[PDB]
């Protein structure tokens, strides 16, 4: 009864019960790719605005779907980063995660100079694509295109870019896939952005502000960017939504903070998000 | 040689019979069936308190007279579904939906099946207008006084429990119309999505000396803690065998050397759980 989209861009029929949970549709996928480490994964969907939105594995997804997706198609992808790819045990957990990464930085939700751009695909060309050959490099150049197709307008720009990747390719020859990708992710871990998810909404004096998870807490972005602020998880006493308000309670303060969101459906959302990634890293630290 | 049995029905009625001998469990639920003309019987088994008071299906190939005398308190055998379906719409005659509406209400007002007083107040409406029909064939609603709406336990509060009951006859008003199978799939559609619907689980000790609830569900084995340290399923496809060994249910994990041992009170216990865990996995497997 459903569609799902790979993180390798491959669109997979499920034939799974009508009442079926997310978690259920979400061991499926796992048991097809052989993911055995399933915890880090779950699916997201387009809601009726276009916005993505994690499932609630502990739901029935059908209804769901028919309720709040335009579309009853789900993607598969990581929904809790971990400070350090090498906690994750099994080949193909590293690759899926790897190639949820590539989606990260070509997608922007990590931005990358050009620099980085560059650096990252020397090592991703070498785990795609093996040792360097000077005939398929050149074939490559035909065939596809190395950067996203907006990212460098100029051509003398782009051609550049192009062969500095190319002599990286040559400087990683010998290098199995696994590691490369290994040391992808391992860049790709210190940037900034990684593991993060924010969303807009207004603090208690109606200033305009992003929230979101991080790694260490949730964090607090003003349009000053004078003072970012994180909540660290291990002061966080107590998180709440009700209504519109997404809202914190710390250990150190009898006062608590307040974030109005756009929606009391999407303060609810931001508020189960956070608490399931407060439990992750409270096991994962 | 003969027994002075007794059935409680679905509709909590107590009928009396003898019991021969040679009297076997699946011939006593063929006559239940018979009587109510359930053609849909599979669903559906007997179960009686043991000798410890724990609920224990009958085994329907034996003689059920044996079964009573080694295991029961009284001679009292209870019908009631032993396989719940995961929607009640693939349920097909009119008259096993019934029989799963009185077992679904059963469940709720036992309190088998945890619900809100929100929950209670919107069952109770759908299940007074299907019990009753339109609250305007009579010439007074005081019938809601005189039957239990809500499951006890919980409910202590005397005006919480006048405004709830206001409640259930201004929604009974609103349902008007409703016909009696409509209401009725309404209440089970409702009680389906229910936490603990379908759950059933027998007493054992986990390898760390700790007190479990083990039973069957769609996804597999699932092993529930009282104390509430963390409800755990293992998953079937990763159970590569299962088995009663001496007092101990076991699962042989696939893809490991893992066995998850679980101690039971007795030899029989083991292989009772083993044999309805194994009939649930192939009720579940008949199921897609």
């Known amino acids: 009864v459903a569609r799902i989209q790979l993180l390798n861009n491959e ?54 779907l028919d309720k709040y997706a335009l579309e009853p198609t789900v993607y598969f992808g990581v929904v809790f980063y971990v400070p350090s790819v090498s906690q994750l045990q099994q080949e193909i957990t590293r690759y899926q995660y790897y190639l949820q990464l590539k989606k990260d930085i070509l997608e922007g939700s990590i931005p990358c100079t050009l620099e ?10 070498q785990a795609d694509f093996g040792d360097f050959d000077q005939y398929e490099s050149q074939d490559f150049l035909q065939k596809f295109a190395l950067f996203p197709v907006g990212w460098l307008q100029d051509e003398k720009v782009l051609e550049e870019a192009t062969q500095k990747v190319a002599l990286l ?32 909404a207004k603090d208690s004096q109606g200033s305009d502000i992003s929230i979101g998870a991080c790694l260490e807490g949730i964090f607090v972005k003003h349009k000053n960017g004078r003072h970012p602020v994180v909540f660290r998880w291990h002061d966080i006493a107590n998180m709440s939504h009700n209504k519109s308000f997404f809202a914190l309670e710390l250990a150190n303060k009898e006062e608590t903070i307040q974030f109005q969101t756009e929606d009391m459906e999407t303060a609810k959302y931001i508020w189960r998000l956070c608490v399931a990634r407060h439990k992750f890293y409270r096991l994962n630290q």
């Open 11 to 64: 669109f997979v029929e499920f034939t799974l019960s009508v009442e079926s949970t997310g978690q259920e549709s979400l061991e499926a996928v796992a048991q097809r790719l052989e993911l055995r480490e399933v915890t880090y994964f779950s699916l997201w969907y387009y809601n009726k605005q276009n916005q993505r939105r994690w499932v609630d594995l502990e739901k029935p997804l059908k209804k769901q």
């Open 116 to 125: 980085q751009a560059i650096q990252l695909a020397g090592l991703a060309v």
């Open 169 to 200: 390719h040559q400087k990683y020859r010998g290098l199995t896939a696994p590691d490369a990708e290994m040391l992808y992710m391992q860049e790709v871990e210190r940037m900034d952005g990684y593991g993060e998810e924010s969303y807009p």
